Design a protein around this nucleic acid. Structure first.
Length: 341
RNA sequence: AUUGUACAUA
């Protein structure tokens, strides 16, 4: 049961329509895939009065559009090209509905955009409604993105309640498909006294996390973006276990990160560790080269190893060229040695 | 990921 006006627009018989001419219909056009796209395109170049006209009609059933498959974009475009009065009046329509909007397929998109264009005051008010519902949002396909956005757009001073909810849950969340996403945002944006207790729990579970399909990304994040102290602990945990973790589908990516982002001395001792150790009847180095995951670690070491150490690593390898040619995964290592040998 | 792993609407 559409209207006559939208019908003729849907069938493309109004090639010069103006926002001024679809008055009384904005609500209906925003709920249509084309009407909406029509509005979205026109609002940026529209006149103040024209946009006030559009707003006049979206203001009363605002929530309704926020959770609509097509209407949410019209609300989103308002936070983008609306006036400060319009952005603030909308933030008011959301006031009281942050939680349910954040767990909504579309609402979650409006919250995320509003968090990008409303002033700090309205951001903080908006984020408080999340207090007491953190772990719930984080573990939600729609909400975890709302949470990630808050961490990215709001002053860390008002994000304490989130760090508190994670108290003793950093491992459960780090190994969670969404959770692991939120923890990284936090490592990237929160204050020193907030990241610290997060990091403590992380370091507590290094062993478990590097082997998790999701945990290995958090530890890798720390190695790529973290402070020396935290990198040192992690390389101290991988140290002595470079052989086993290299053969793991997930952990092998983490020891690649250590070899790379550790300090010079640390890096040098990690690479030496695979030369020394003896995996059963024969060297550990031989074991890695033939492995489906470890050959990647052995290769990453040959790249980061300084000339002095690479030389020895190459020399340690030279003995098994013959064996490398027969092992499928062994070829790739040989294909590197080959060059500068 | 190239011989190997994770993010949501027309």
């Amino acid at each position: 049961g559409r209207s006559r006006l939208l019908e003729d627009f849907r069938n493309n018989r109004y090639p010069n329509l103006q926002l001024r001419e679809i008055a009384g219909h904005i609500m209906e056009f925003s709920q249509d895939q084309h009407g909406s796209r029509f509005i979205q395109l026109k609002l940026e170049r529209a006149t103040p009065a024209e946009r006030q006209l559009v707003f006049n009609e979206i203001l009363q059933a605002a929530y309704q559009l926020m959770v609509d498959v097509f209407g949410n974009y019209v609300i989103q475009k308002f936070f983008e090209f609306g006036s400060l009065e319009q952005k603030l009046a909308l933030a008011e329509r959301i006031r009281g509905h942050v939680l349910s909007l954040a767990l909504q397929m579309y609402g979650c998109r409006v919250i995320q955009k509003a968090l990008e264009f409303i002033p700090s005051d309205q951001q903080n008010e908006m984020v408080r409604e999340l207090d007491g519902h953190v772990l719930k949002c984080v573990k939600d396909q729609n909400g975890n993105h709302v949470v990630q956005k808050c961490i990215e757009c709001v002053q860390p001073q008002s994000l304490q309640f989130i760090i508190d909810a994670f108290k003793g849950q950093v491992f459960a969340l780090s190994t969670h498909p969404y959770g692991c996403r939120v923890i990284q945002r936090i490592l990237e944006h929160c204050l020193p006294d907030q990241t610290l207790p997060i990091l403590e729990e992380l370091h507590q579970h290094t062993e478990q996390l590097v082997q998790d399909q999701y945990g290995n990304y958090v530890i890798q994040h720390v190695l790529e973006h973290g402070r020396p102290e935290d990198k040192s602990k992690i390389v101290a945990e991988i140290r002595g276990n470079v052989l086993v973790l290299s053969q793991h589908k997930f952990a092998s990516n983490v020891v690649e990160k250590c070899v790379t982002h550790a300090s010079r001395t640390e890096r040098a001792v990690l690479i030496d560790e695979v030369c020394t150790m003896n995996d059963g009847p024969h060297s550990a180095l031989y074991t890695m080269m033939k492995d489906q995951y470890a050959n990647y670690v052995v290769q990453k070491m040959i790249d980061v190893a300084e000339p002095g150490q690479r030389k020895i690593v190459m020399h340690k390898i030279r003995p098994h060229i013959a064996t490398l040619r027969k092992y499928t995964y062994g070829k790739h290592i040989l294909a590197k040695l080959e060059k500068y040998y």
